[PDB]
Copies of this chain bind each other. A is one copy, B any other.
Amino acid sequence: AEAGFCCPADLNQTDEARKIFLDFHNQVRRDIAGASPLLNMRNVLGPAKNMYRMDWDCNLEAKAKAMIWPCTTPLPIDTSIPQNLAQWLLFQNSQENEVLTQTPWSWVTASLRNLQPDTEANIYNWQIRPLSNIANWQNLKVGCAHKVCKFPTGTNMVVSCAYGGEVLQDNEVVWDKGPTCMCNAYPNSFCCNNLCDTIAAATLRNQPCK
């Protein structure tokens, strides 16, 4: 049923928030795999083969929390790992989960904006780094944190996501062009809602918290 994140209490974030961030990632990955519209400029990418479902990593979440928690200008961002950072203006009437739902899409918007009609979106360049982190077919783990920071420049919502694996470099293949639901990179693969997955990953994510 509901997702087992099983993260330590001291991370001080709700599973509902974790779910928003993780569902966001898989939604982007699924849109690319199925060549479906991303935002409600170029807005359709893919299709892609071997685009697999991401799972949470509580250690990556802790890294993300550490990068934003001091609320300093600038933040102690760890550029030695793949990560995305976003900041969102808060208004009097701002509702937290709406903010958390909307904020990450800014990474998709920023990246798409830099796509020219001729740009190979599946190939990395610095102008599309945030989307590339999200759609990296080689990375299956993510952890994100959020915080209302009172910076000297004013109060904002800050979101950081840290990713498994390596920082992408120039001209790396971010994802592989191919048919939706072609899933053969891993043993015992299946496809659900246009996103590849494996029995091993499903079995692991459904283990009870301990």
Residues of A within 8 A of B (CB): 1, 179-181, 188-193, 197, 199, 202, 206
Contacts and interface: CB of A to CB of B under 8 A. Distances in A.
Chain multiplicity (copies) = 2
A179 B208 CA distance: 14
B193 A197 contact: no
17 contacts: A1-B179, A1-B180, A1-B181, A188-B188, A188-B199, A189-B199, A190-B190, A190-B192, A190-B197, A190-B199, A190-B202, A191-B192, A191-B202, A192-B192, A192-B193, A193-B193, A199-B199
Contacts of A202: 190-191
Contacts of A199: 188-190, 199
A181 B189 CA distance: 17
Please indicate which of the listed interface residues A190, A191, A192, A199 has the most CB atoms of chain B within 10 Å of its own CB. Answer: A190
Nearest to A182: B206
A59 B193 CA distance: 29
A105 to B, nearest CB: 24
Contacts of A197: 190
A46 to B, nearest CB: 13
A191 B206 CA distance: 12
A42 B191 CA distance: 33
Contacts of A190: 190, 192, 197, 199, 202
